[PDB]
Write an enzyme that holds these catalytic residues in place. Structure first.
Site, PDB file in Angstrom:
ATOM      1  N   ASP A   1       5.093   5.165 -13.556  1.00 58.15           N
ATOM      2  CA  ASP A   1       6.478   5.568 -13.760  1.00 58.15           C
ATOM      3  C   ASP A   1       6.634   6.351 -15.063  1.00 58.15           C
ATOM      4  O   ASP A   1       7.183   7.468 -15.092  1.00 58.15           O
ATOM      5  CB  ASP A   1       7.326   4.303 -13.762  1.00 58.15           C
TER       6      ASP A   1
ATOM      7  N   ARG B   1       1.918  -0.512 -11.579  1.00 55.75           N
ATOM      8  CA  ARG B   1       0.900   0.210 -10.833  1.00 55.75           C
ATOM      9  C   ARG B   1       0.533   1.530 -11.512  1.00 55.75           C
ATOM     10  O   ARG B   1       1.291   2.089 -12.314  1.00 55.75           O
ATOM     11  CB  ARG B   1       1.365   0.464  -9.399  1.00 55.75           C
TER      12      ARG B   1
ATOM     13  N   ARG C   1      12.555  -7.270  -6.550  1.00 51.90           N
ATOM     14  CA  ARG C   1      12.780  -6.130  -7.434  1.00 51.90           C
ATOM     15  C   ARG C   1      13.961  -5.316  -6.936  1.00 51.90           C
ATOM     16  O   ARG C   1      14.071  -5.038  -5.739  1.00 51.90           O
ATOM     17  CB  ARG C   1      11.562  -5.189  -7.521  1.00 51.90           C
TER      18      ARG C   1
ATOM     19  N   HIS D   1       0.841  -1.188   0.000  1.00 58.97           N
ATOM     20  CA  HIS D   1       0.000   0.000   0.000  1.00 58.97           C
ATOM     21  C   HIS D   1       0.877   1.239   0.000  1.00 58.97           C
ATOM     22  O   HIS D   1       1.839   1.307   0.774  1.00 58.97           O
ATOM     23  CB  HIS D   1      -0.932   0.041   1.213  1.00 58.97           C
TER      24      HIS D   1
HETATM   25 CL   LIG Z   1       6.385   2.661  -7.793  1.00 61.80          CL
END
Ligand SMILES: [Cl-]
Ligand SMILES: [Cl-]
Ligand SMILES: [Cl-]
Lengths: 932, 935
Positions: free
Chosen positions: A586, A624, A439, A168
């Site tokens: 991004d 995201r 990641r 979150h």
């Molecule tokens: Cl991010």
């Protein structure tokens, strides 16, 4: 005590009509608000309740007509509050908004669908009230696309939906409060049963008040293990039970088109992945030990759930007729040492062979749990690894034996009960529930290989050209000599990278998914991860997944992936499967949203062309934010909007933490989520969206040029923009505040370029302004309308007939629905220098123009003209959010400016302004949910 | 496949009318039967299904018109079956009857009550459709009796209903089959939701078929006649099924009903309105398999079950208890507990911080519960542990104290609503169930104690306690209890029985008092038996002795009982030991076996009267424990009137009743059935305490005394005076096969040689219940009513007044009539024809004539023309069951003839699709499950 009559009047004025005739949202929210305000009066006094209700009434009047006088009327009250009253009021509106969400969820889950409301085209897939369920999709594939039932079934067999849980960006809601929200939803729904008895209704009322108070009377930035524990709660809440029910519904829909098989219980139609404890991108708090911890914790939760599920399975499996094979195994298992079912049976006899075998499985599950717990809390065990299940085949084998035997004896129906559900749970969830992705930035791999080559007296891998890097990496992957030993100067970062690899190496492969390279640009990044993986003795290396973030990176991505597929070593390592990740938030931070959208469509197109060229099965991983980041029905059309053949039966999507509760909190909401992901993947594989007309692609290319020009000219060229961003927005307080689990700036010194995407979106979302989402659309649409009179007609054609375009525009319109320039102007008036005050006026004019142009493109006179249900629910939340906005603005002025003394009011009851600010941030965050 | 049209036709002819308009019983059983018969066709062939359906249709036609031809058609098919088909058909009808039962339970549980059907008197309390619920009982007490709500509330505070689980006389159904029945009831109920979607309905059908098949494909014969530990495990299933969750729901409804009459308090969470006791593992009367170790086992097993359930429940409690505002007292405890080592909530939290004090306390309680479970498990499985006793809860107060601290603390801060949630449910469960769920009673014959004391006095050269008169026995016992020197040591010749008694006492001393209730003396007759148990308890070092309870079985024991209890209260030692509370037991099945049913009923009313007189004289609070069978032994709504029927002041807020194993599924298997069971016990106890039944008119008493003389004369004259009665009983009934068959967990004959006198009551009732004849229940009534009608023309009217106005008499007659509904003389005649000698045929014929006469006389007494004229719902469900039971009757009869007579060769039929002993066991279990309770 007639206050309820007034709040009833204000709610009816806010949402006047009925979006249906099961429209009980106004009723629901009126009930929750009455009960909450009575509790508030009882706990903190009459004065506090009267003040709070005055604030909400003014808020509803504002969301009614948007009179600026109402905002100063709120502010006069909110600034005169000493920090105690400020905290109690902010807490109160947070829980009120939460209750509006819970009521809203009950409305969505029990809204009756309407068959006569379907239009017959793809627009129906943008709302849960008109989208196609599983069987409507089947009949769409059979009738319109002339696909045979056999073809649909085989497609389903080979389909996989892989849902990835990410952390979150703020408050990862604690498991206890999830449970409390569950009880509140259950009480609401049952209170409206059209058959309820007087006493049951009274006891339900008493339970509802009791639960609202329970949630209201509970007050580190939780350790990554704690956040992971919280993120996993949805498995216990709904997903564990929900998955076999959905798969069974798939079986039923297949029976209703003539298919007599069920979906094979081992077919991975649903898979779950997690980043929680694996994403290290700009997060030094995620250590090797954190990753090992969440891996073992996940294996523990899984063993517990299987253990608890297998006892009722043992009670059901009381047959005696069995296979010769099963009888042999039962007599074998009977030769051993019975401690975990003495309350049930002294021992399992041989005339109940399924119970014998299943009891031995339950025993191995118990030893599996205790071993994982022992490794987690210490570092070693003593529980023999052979007394547990280490891979999915050791686990599945006896269950499959039971299934074979039961079908052998004409007991197939019994097998399709608790046993089929169990098998489907083992196949979906494995021994870990989730597979952890790791990641890390590519730059860290450059640092590690650079320390390695400098240590070998060969030069600096960093100074080497990309081609020289590739050639050296390839010569090492094809060689037999190891690369380095303990004798290696490791910086703290380099040692972190290598230690992470060592931890991956010492854990079961079932816990891991993909190794994700942030800021990936070239094949040498992928080869660097593959080599570092192999030389740290990871026996089964993870599949490497490059993350192409910036726009130029997206353009260079298909060349780099083709070059990767062309080198023999990587081609033999991947074995015909490749996963590539693209990042919408991004990329939007880089070049604006409109440009990132069109660039991601083209980039997916080109990646598919490469994948067909080299015979590799490509999986596009959607990061995201973005168009792929929405809640509910819109997602169905989102998936249908992807370019043809980009999915091909293998979907991987991020379930953003800001939507995960709306999507999996309730039984029905969860089932429908799984249903629409599966159905949209299946339909898209057999019925791709139309290919864009050539003039559509030329038009989007020009609009992309103008939109990136405007976006970079405002965000990156304007010299005083960074100062304005630091004033008109709570970005500084968000980063300083120990809120985001990780830090905001990657490098602390840098500008927006180094600022991460999550705080970039968040900072402007808090002020109901959302500039990163819509900025650039205005000039792009103005440019094409002025360049040619007819382009508006073309634009309106695209919005009506091109799904990609429709979903992009739909997202902008939805974000504008959550925007209000007046509140943003209040932030400007309080927090921004007078030297810089006209700047926000210009940006706000851009806001209005962009809004009008989006309306023109969509053929709408009001925002969300086509989705009145969502307009209704959002308008409902806005009344609470506006109050948290005004409170946050004045609290910010009070924090930054100790020269701003206020005429305080006397303390109210209860029988630090930093805390209040955090309250407003979490509240506004919870009320606005997803934007971009 | 139009077979469904025929079974529908036969079902509608069996149950024609509608007992309401939510009467979906015929639909329910038709649907279940269709699905079952389809499964039967798929697994065992088409011929098997047609044979079974032909049999059922004939059975339903027989239960329709009772045409004797239908029985010969059934027998003709059933004798021609080789043992394999006999097993498949018998199993098939057992599971079909079970489905009729399940449909019946759903119909009962979801039948809407009718307010306009109440007549306004006590007769309404004999059926669930008209009985008074909790709030209706409150308003009946307030309006008609002008009792204040505060008086009702104080009565509830001090009322206790104590339910005692005893072993099932046959198949105590395995926990797994209970669970399958639960899933079937749920699929049915959900299948009839008037809003259900097509896919949901299809998937529910698939689940229903799947579950019916699951139940049909499990064996129910092999392994052992389950060890007493296993039977106890199976008997405890109802706590997990419904009772654990059920207790707090009921108490909360009590709170709401108290609120609806103006009472603002709730029932105190520590108030024992509901208690549970168990005999499973404690009753040794004529059962040597029940050993001292069995008792230790079921005590520790129960302690485990309780700790497990508390452990699983306290995690949700920990999630709810997330507050931070708290008491100063609770805050202090939170800081103290925080000073320690946190192993059982790592999946939830790494550790519990001090800003969640309720979670701190509850987490430490959870830790203590885990240590208790593993420790009791270690004691059970070894004999020692290593878990420190101080790290566990040894008594209920260590457990209750921190929970009360949380409640007090929560209420201090205005969080009373939160405390009245998951926490209040928890406190009431701790108070109701304690650390054991149940308290185990121990029961033993008085004679075994006589053997022990006799070996003792013989070893000390003072004489034989057995030869001593009752007064000398008393004198010696009294001299020994007041002395300071021990009685015996290891140097004592003990027979096996004497060692059983002493080891039982030694095991009692070594376990927590929380596990035990009462020491019950079978065949109690004199005060020396009770003083013997108190003495053996004290001298075997039982630190907190159990309360002693005499069980007065025979009629003479009942008549002498108030004298013996008075003599007991008059001794100073026993008076100060009992501390003003006494529990005495009376046995309905035992007394009926001794003197017929009518005399035992009236004698038990008078005996309770006299015991109350003694208790009031001596200022002792008396508790009457009602044993098995009897008027107090029924299922469902009737119990409500039964309790209301007891003599005035015999209850006084402390009720103790045996919940018989043959009814426990009907009463606690389903959610609603459970709630209403608890409701009617609580309401009937409260109402009887404040509103006794009318006192009998003197002529009613004299009349019943006469009937008692004539009825005992007929009963004993048939059972005990006829020499060839024992010969007949062994032929016309499977009594011999019940005892020989490893069916009853204990044996039938007490002394293997003896007659019916030594035969236990359970096989006595069972043997005749299997043949649909029910002789032990009605024999004697015929002659009694005939005698009083003939002596005076007007006595019939008097009888009819009593049935209409005297609750005791009405419940007795209601019970006899219900047993007659389950009787069929034709089937008994078939047993006679197949199994009984010809020269004994007129004997059974004569007995059957008595059967007919009593039936008519009972009707004349109740003012009814048909059986169960006033309860068509029960008549309907019984008619439904009888259609299945009849086939198991004919099959059992011919199977018995095949077993006893290998010279009876039958023309066999070819085997159908893929040992007569197993068949017989099947028929016994099935018929028993369909007839359930009688007397
Ligand atoms: Cl991010
Ligand atoms: Cl941890
Ligand atoms: Cl008995």
């Amino acid at each position: 005590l007639e206050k309820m009559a007034s709040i009833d009047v204000h709610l009816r004025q806010l949402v006047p009509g009925k979006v249906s005739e099961d429209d009980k949202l106004v009723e629901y929210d009126a009930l929750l608000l009455d009960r909450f305000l009575d509790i508030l009066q009882d706990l903190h006094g009459e004065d506090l309740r009267e003040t709070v209700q005055e604030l909400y009434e003014h808020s509803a009047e504002y969301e009614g007509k948007h009179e600026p006088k109402k905002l100063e009327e709120l502010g006069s009250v909110l600034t005169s509050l000493d920090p105690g009253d400020s905290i109690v009021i902010a807490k109160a509106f947070s829980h009120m908004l939460n209750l509006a969400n819970l009521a809203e969820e009950v409305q969505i889950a029990y809204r009756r669908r309407i068959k006569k409301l379907k239009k017959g085209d793809f627009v129906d897939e943008s709302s849960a009230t008109t989208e196609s369920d599983l069987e409507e999709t089947f009949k769409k594939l059979v009738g319109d696309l002339n696909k045979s039932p056999e073809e649909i079934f085989d497609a389903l067999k080979n389909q996989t939906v892989d849902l990835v849980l990410t952390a979150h960006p703020t408050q990862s809601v604690r498991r206890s409060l999830l449970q409390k929200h569950g009880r509140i939803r259950d009480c609401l729904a049952q209170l409206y049963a059209k058959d309820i008895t007087p006493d049951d209704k009274q006891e339900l009322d008493e339970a509802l008040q009791r639960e609202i108070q329970a949630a209201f009377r509970t007050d580190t930035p939780p350790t990554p293990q704690d956040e992971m524990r919280a993120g996993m709660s949805y498995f216990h809440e709904t997903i564990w039970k929900g998955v076999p029910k959905f798969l069974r519904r798939v079986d039923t829909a297949l029976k209703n088109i003539g298919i007599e098989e069920r979906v094979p219980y081992n077919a991975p139609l649903i898979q779950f992945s997690s980043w929680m404890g694996g994403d290290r991108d700009g997060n030094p708090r995620v250590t090797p030990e954190v990753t090992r911890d969440v891996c073992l914790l996940a294996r523990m939760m899984a063993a517990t759930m299987y253990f608890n599920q297998i006892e009722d399975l043992m009670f059901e499996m009381s047959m005696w007729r069995c296979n010769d094979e099963l009888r042999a195994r039962a007599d074998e298992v009977h030769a051993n040492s019975a401690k975990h079912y003495i309350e049930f049976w002294k021992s399992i006899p041989t005339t109940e062979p399924y119970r014998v075998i299943l009891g031995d499985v339950r025993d191995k599950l118990y030893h599996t749990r205790e071993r994982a717990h022992q490794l987690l809390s210490n570092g070693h065990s003593d529980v023999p690894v052979e007394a547990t299940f280490i891979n999915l085949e050791q686990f599945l084998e006896p269950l499959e034996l039971c299934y074979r035997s039961l079908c052998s004896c004409g007991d197939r129906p019994i097998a399709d009960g608790s046993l089929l559900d169990f098998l489907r749970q083992v196949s979906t969830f494995g021994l870990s529930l989730v597979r952890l992705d790791i990641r890390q930035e590519s730059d860290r791999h450059t640092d590690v290989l650079d320390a390695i080559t400098t240590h070998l007296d060969i030069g600096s891998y960093r100074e080497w050209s990309e081609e020289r890097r590739q050639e050296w990496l390839l010569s090492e992957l094809s060689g037999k000599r190891p690369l380095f030993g303990s004798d290696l100067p490791k910086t703290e970062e380099i040692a972190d990278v290598l230690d992470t690899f060592h931890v991956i190496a010492e854990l079961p492969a079932d816990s891991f998914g993909a190794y994700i390279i942030s800021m990936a640009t070239a094949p040498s990044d992928v080869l660097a991860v593959e080599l570092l993986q192999r030389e740290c003795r990871v026996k089964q290396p993870l599949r490497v997944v490059p993350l192409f973030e910036k726009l130029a990176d997206l353009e260079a991505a298909p060349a780099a992936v083709a070059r990767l597929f062309s080198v023999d070593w990587y081609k033999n390592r991947i074995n015909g499967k490749q996963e590539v990740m693209i990042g919408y938030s991004d990329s939007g931070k880089d070049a604006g949203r409109l440009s990132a959208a069109w660039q991601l469509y083209k980039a997916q197109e080109e990646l598919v062309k490469v994948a067909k060229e080299y015979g590799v099965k490509l999986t596009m991983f959607h990061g995201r934010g973005g168009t792929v980041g929405r809640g509910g029905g819109p997602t169905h059309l989102v998936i249908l909007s992807q370019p043809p053949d980009t999915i091909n039966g293998s979907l991987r999507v991020t379930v953003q933490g800001e939507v995960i509760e709306q999507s999996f909190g309730e039984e029905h909401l969860c089932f429908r989520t799984l249903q629409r992901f599966t159905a949209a993947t299946l339909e898209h594989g057999m019925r791709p969206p139309i290919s864009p007309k050539p003039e559509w692609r030329a038009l989007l290319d020009e609009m992309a040029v103008v939109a990136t020009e405007e976006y970079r000219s405002v965000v990156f060229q304007e010299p005083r923009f960074v100062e304005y961003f630091r004033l008109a927005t709570p970005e500084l307080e968000y980063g300083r505040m120990n809120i985001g689990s990780r830090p905001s700036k990657r490098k602390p010194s840098g500008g927006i370029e180094s600022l991460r995407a999550i705080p970039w979106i968040f900072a402007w979302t808090q002020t109901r302004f959302h500039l990163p989402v819509w900025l650039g659309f205005g000039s792009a649409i103005r440019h094409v309308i002025e360049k040619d009179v007819r382009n508006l007609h073309m634009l309106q054609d695209m919005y009506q007939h091109w799904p990609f375009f429709r979903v992009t525009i739909d997202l902008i319109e939805m974000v504008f629905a959550k925007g209000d320039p007046g509140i943003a102007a209040l932030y400007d008036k309080l927090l921004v220098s007078e030297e810089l005050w006209p700047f926000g006026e210009k940006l706000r004019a851009n806001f209005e123009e962009t809004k009008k142009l989006i309306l023109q493109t969509a053929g709408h006179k009001d925002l969300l003209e086509g989705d009145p249900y969502l307009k209704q629910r959002l308008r409902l939340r806005d009344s609470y959010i506006t109050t948290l906005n005004v409170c946050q603005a004045y609290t910010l002025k009070r924090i930054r400016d100790p020269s701003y003394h206020v005429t305080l009011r006397p303390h109210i009851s209860k029988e630090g302004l930093e805390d209040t600010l955090i309250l407003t941030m979490k509240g506004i965050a919870a009320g606005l949910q997803n934007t971009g």
